[model samples]
Target: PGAPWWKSAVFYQVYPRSFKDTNGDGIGDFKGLTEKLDYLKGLGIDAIWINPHYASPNTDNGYDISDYREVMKEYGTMEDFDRLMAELKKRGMRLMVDVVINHSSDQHEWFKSSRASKDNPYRDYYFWRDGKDGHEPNNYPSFFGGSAWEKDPVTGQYYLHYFGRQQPDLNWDTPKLREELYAMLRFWLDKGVSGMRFDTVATYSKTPGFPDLTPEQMKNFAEAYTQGPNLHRYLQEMHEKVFDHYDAVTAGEIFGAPLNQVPLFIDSRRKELDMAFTFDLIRYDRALDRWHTIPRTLADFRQTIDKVDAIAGEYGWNTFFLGNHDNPRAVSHFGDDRPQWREASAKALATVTLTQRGTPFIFQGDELGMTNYPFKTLQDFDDIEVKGFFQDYVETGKATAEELLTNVALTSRDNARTPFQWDDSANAGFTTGKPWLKVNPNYTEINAAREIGDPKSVYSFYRNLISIRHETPALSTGSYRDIDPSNADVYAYTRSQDGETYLVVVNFKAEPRSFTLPDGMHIAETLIESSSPAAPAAGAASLELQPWQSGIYKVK
Candidate 1:
């Protein structure tokens, strides 16, 4: 019997507004995406997961949804969405959309009605609490900073907003609200969506009573708010109501859920999420004591992957990604993005992640080796989280403007939200008018037009990598075993299933390195390799690799 389709599929995540604009409005829309369906299909992606295109306030870049059913005017109308869906269906492609149910924009009718009066029928749709001690509801701070409680002058009560004040948390305790969310999921599924990327999925439930936390505890509030008491029950209900009925794949953005508890959410049998987006490795290199930036090391990367592989065991699946709509360019984040080594490192990273035992996600623009733009001032940023961080951290004397900008340059989400580099024309062929965010200046040299047909380009490397993943079952469903667990510069692992074994070796540094093969292991053939790595001969004891080299070999 064959495994589930998603188990071996390659997912491409598209941030809609930044993808491509067909109109002269400088914003990408559904029509633009329909025109580009051929491009995505040519990229060998099995599924496309688009970020939210629903009616939103755009405070959090379409995350603050206002209407669950209506399409965002900026994106186009329902007719356009239906056309796009039909186009995808014609190409035999699957579509997965972002679902932001953790919170709704304050402009949403639910919040508006809930805030109208203390005794309103919708008052219980969101978390509302009376002000304690004449100040606010609690000491808990919002994810965007300041108190999580917002005062409603009309009601004389405060409401909880885990994110920005524009995004008020929905009360899952209300059966009506939960049913509404499930219905929304079904609405999308009914329209032929293959799955949902659940945004802040673990934050849907909260502790029974809102409570204050100490400074140390505040740093780890995700532990309390993420996996609340009723989270599992809510997910099981959703699975039974929506997911189970469709041939769907569900991925949850889980924060602060420990390794041991992860299986409960994604272990196939649980019927919860199909996979999870974990940030264990992404959170490395930051410190609570200083405003300085520390780069993550190869050891740090290996440790996290190893732990996750162990915790996943044989059941839980991993949603593997090196970049996303909310992260910096993968080449810039994990590999060398400098002109000399950009393509090589980008391919190396792709080779490593795509070969891992999990479902790989390719973020838009990543295939073309996109780099972060140099934002000289705060005016260049469009992300609310980065802006809020600057306000709370820089203005309060806790950090300097330069320090904050430096951090933003290194880790800000806006880095990934820049317009896609389709060509070398104005705005990199992403728009005919001014782009919502500045296009990276490197687009002139690094873009689809320049790399699409070039065999050595990052785009070609990604295409070939995906082809390999699709044909190799061991790469997708095999056991994961680290071969060089403690190597400071080299990350090596092997995947085995049935009688097949494949080895992947990556040199994460920008310098040459030599690696010795494990005892008695022999390379049967070279499957694929990145720049500067000579394919090893059978029974070779060691191999010398060039800087940023990656190699995948069929082992005997």
Candidate 2:
């Protein structure tokens, strides 16, 4: 009759470093998160997915793990983590951690030992090949940029890193490496986590023989190191040894796995993951690449939804979201973020996110109608992608500094990393100390404290939208169909199960739009208050919507 707890539940993402800083260290900690559980529960979030807070060098904002067992000291101690777990349990909410298994910090003991000598016991734990005539063994470029292999002077061999050189790729082909990962999974599952959001889940396995990339493959360089030959065998074994044993709720960050091949990873029959995040929709703006972002069309939005929904309804499930810690803020990326339309379009976007046929994720700050930060200079950027690409592109003369900064202002990951604005106080009530990243200056006008009481606030609207989803069964588990897949200014869809049907329509623009009910369907009742006056006259077949208007209705 229904799916797992996560499928029907609403999940909120918390980027720890920016969520709240209780320690006055300018970095958010477990205590900061623990203080907000009640606030999150009030918003109807059933679970939370947080970025990695493990001990790290922090070269990639906690993605480079030096020790998986220990918590990042700046974030908090193990006791603080346990307290957060306790508080969430008290509030009937769950926690899913981001486990970055594909790579480990070079500071990790395994890497340290592995790099000490050619005959070290841990040498095989990572890919280490002797230099071929004082050059990298192969020419695979890093996902961050430049060469993928980093030479280790100590061992006189080059090691592989798919991302920055600080994070060396783990050799999944090694049996011991796989076993350690399985052990880490149990250690976290036992620590009371619901499960993990596997970081870069599709890139763990590497192609055998370390072949050089073809010139054509360089255009889409990500594929050169992703969806390797043995990725499935590894996940299947992981399920057999850990996931099934724990009944763990898992979501894999699968960026490179093809849509057609994703079922092999998430289909229940495959026993790999419960769901996976495919970026064809959110990253639609970057069809050319991350450096050049294109304006998204309502048509693009509608088509991606249809493709994702159709796949989810049949073969496997998908995760729904407009943005996360790695992307720009939702309202800025998908809807209008200007003063006139920020709040209205935020609610409209929420309507679309929650009503989709997949498990929905609300990235923090979006509830308060967060917008992207206007990053101006190289010093303003805190993300590794920005720094890495800046250097690589500059070296190749790909673009001038000013030209790259233009794209950086629009596409930098720091756009989503700004500290949470809890109030209008100094540092936006996020910290008393200097924040790791500057708080968005507009925090005074947009904050959780200001929105909590306003009935018409974006926070309240999202809360209402989430409640509507829980109250309606068809909205959560129903079959989805696009009512007007090619509609230019409006997104219209229906969720139906048995004889119960619900209609959702949204004008995803600043200008007004009109939608007409199809034959055999009539609006029965408004499920929730909408942005515009959506109530139709008795026997009316058409509904006129105002700017950024959205509504859900029971249809008969």
Candidate 3:
């Protein structure tokens, strides 16, 4: 129906290090993933987007690629990866690898040589800018915490790293560097990789200015090291050289890109990338004043999703995902405390978002309705982002390190990175040894083994939801129309196509609420209720909804 195979396909993203452990060494590996391809196939997923499993010291998990050619020894050898790829193909699952060409680990052979001396040939491979009058260049802050530039004693120049001091940003301005990155993409493509999930793809092309922060906005600007100029040029170059060769899905992890720049991402006949995932929906809960704050309303979530689609609908492709390795679990973010609300909220979110006109991506444990786990201390946290944000408190002299840690106790990356709860065994069957990161302590009750076949369980609800989406054409490739965003507590919308219509009304509040059907539309009963057998019926002059309940109706 479209240029790429992904347009009509369902994608499942797997964070490799936390999915399943086969060696009993506390870390998930390729061999285990090979055994589980059937699990994904059974779910009717078309492709799998694997988080980075490359060789690294893991300053930023496997995002910090050291030896790009070889699979990390901790995961498995190249042979194991090939076996996994073969198995996935045999199961009809397409494979998408994480391409982290934006930067490599400081321990990488190229970076080690580049840092050794200014005379090193590899020195030009990365962004090496001279410091101003013996201090760091510009006031750019790293994604981790402190200054983006790290000085070298021998080279006498500061290298730019958007993330940790170890992950020096690459010099996309250099043609030699661009060619080298393309070579890496070709390596994986040659090995039968279907496509790639580009990691921080847009950050590679930054403004040549590298200007310091403005006087009034200096504080907030520190958190934004993204959305630089020349982004399109680098993207186009990558596509022309690497991505365009394969009929593959190249999705960008774009952050902070302005509204007008989106169409360019999918322009020139899907030029650079076939599809893109931006942080537009991600900021639904984030306050402009505070990054840590999550807005506690469904209206906020609905408005952002609607606005983003409106902005990019005519040209280009959009990807929708609720949970990832970075964000908190969707169940906690969207649902209230009540079980009815939990089940209804999850199903409603799926009915609304998945039915929207985009590729729906399911994160690893989201189908099981996983919630964020509360961490008691900094020791319970493991991700570089959370750890680095804590360091920000120390550097700014604003909040105590302890205070920052306490705040991050809720937003810790480990909230999402916790090992998958497969079963009730000790360590949640994630590991016989201690997990690479902590398993969510609620695994005894919240796990796949217990809920997968339980008809009343959230897992089965998700499977039904997927089946509904596949069976209902209006949910896919339909014209989406938005209701008033200002409507209190309920994020309501309608979908129409081929003389048929579907209406979805969700109650975000605790008490029951009602909304009148638009004009002459008639709501027809659909069997898409959540776990609660007592959910309100569909056909009413005014649609009534319970707290956190969502009603999906096929209307005429």
Candidate 4:
């Protein structure tokens, strides 16, 4: 096989602050993560995607980069990072850190100098424009709402920020800035990181000659910066400058990335990223206003997945993830998060996403069936993005306070940031002191300590599910075929490689569902089954699935 190690690896995402705490400072740090290396190894993860631990102001929870080369003081010193790397290498695991090059924190030296004077040399390092038509530079709304332009009182110019005002978007158009970023990538790779996950990677290139957006596009103007004319040029250049030298993998967090352009990003021949992630499936429930979302339906869910799969084609690659630090919990959003169905539904969703054609990713706490916090008030949310949305929508009279609260309760990014539930301790075994943020109240019932050894637990189910992919190459390199594309209750598909065929069926609803194998095929072997006992005989009438169940079967 000519595939890279990442092509078959299962990656686990760890948000540093929420993972573990060793100093009893009520925050997770490098020492805490080093102590849990055995736990991750036992889960059979090939690599871990550690979110930003660099020096930062934490304005957006570490997304704002103050210094690319220095480790955050809270995370620890360079020595701590080296120890973590040595431990991972010894355990036969790899480390992939987040690269937030799309923007820099306002407190960064470059930004401070840029705003000091109009003729500052570093002014061009960022996008600085004068007031347009007596208003902000353009009508583009930031990803967190409000105008994307922030005026500098001293410099008499406005800086562009696709995200929050604290994060000023970098000027990739500047040749020197691009060279500096490429050097940063080399720095990390030299430090023994095996891969990098670029933050808002597609925004590196923007449409030249910034123009105002029409009223219709204002709702989602942040996407306008994606897929710019120079995006591929920058990516190809970076590949030659840094990526080609090392056998490291690269993944981009591309928002609003269209299917037609995916090939340019992940095609092996293109020399760009090894894989890219988009919000195709997760956008199914997004409302037109872009601030709230409704419940997702089965039809919408399948359509999105099929579209992405078809667009990736047979050679291009993508990442398989349902929940991350930026979204709500997977089991809460797509599967039933109720007490009775939490475990079963979590396993079912895992089977659906991991058994597909892409490299599987498991976010921390997801395997233990972590769920969204029951945030009753806006004060409970710690994400600047969520706070921005609530402030803008409610003040503008676009949504009532109650309506916004209810929507955010179901969709806030903070839902996934609660302290990890390790056991039934005072703070869910996360910290001895009061956590920086409150731990989920339900951690007592849903915790890793209680479920790790239970054969039927969700965590154990994920372990076996990952093992299946390792044992069966068909699940990783097989050709995909949709079996029941129109089924509203059950989502089914098939993957074939060599001379073996594997069928995957998942129930997406709360009621019992009966499905007959497409073309009247029969199950030859039970590779994996999730809580459903009704197995079908050769060409039997049908297979019955209990609520929130899934199975992987071998067929002729």
Backbone Cα, N, C clashes tallied per candidate: 0, 0, 0, 0
Q: What would you estimate as the lDDT of candidate 3?
A: 0.76
lDDT of model number 1: 0.86
TM-scores, all candidates, are 0.97, 0.98, 0.94, 0.97
Candidate 2 per-residue lDDT, tens place, 1-556, comes to: 4578877888999999999998788999899999989899999999999999899999998999999999998889999999999999998899999989999999999999999998888988899986676689988888787788888878778999999899999988999988998998899998879968999898988989888788877777776566589999999999999888886699998876666676777888888999888877888788445777887689888998788666664657878998898888889888989998899999999999989888899999999998999777778888888877777887679878888888877777888899999999998899999999999999999999999999999999999999999988788778898888778798999999778999998898798788888887888888875577647664557789898899888887
Error of model 3, residue 375, in angstroms: 0.5
User: Which TM-score value belongs to model 1?
Assistant: 0.97
Descending-lDDT candidate ranking: 2, 4, 1, 3
Measured by TM-score, how close is model 4 to the native structure? 0.97
Clashes of 2: 0
- lDDT value, residue 16 of candidate 4: 91
Task: Pull out the clashing pairs in model 1.
Answer: none
- Residue-level lDDT of model 3, residues 50-104, one tens digit each, is 9998898888889898888989878999999999988988887899898898889
Model 4: weakest 10-residue lDDT segment is 533-542
Candidate 1 per-residue C-alpha lDDT over 10-54 given as tens digits, one digit per residue, 9 for 90 to 100: 999999999989888988999988899999999898899999999
Model 4 segments beyond 4 Å from truth?
A: 538-541
Compared with the true structure, all predictions reach lDDT values of 0.86, 0.87, 0.76, 0.86
Candidate 1 C-alpha RMSD relative to the actual structure: 1.5
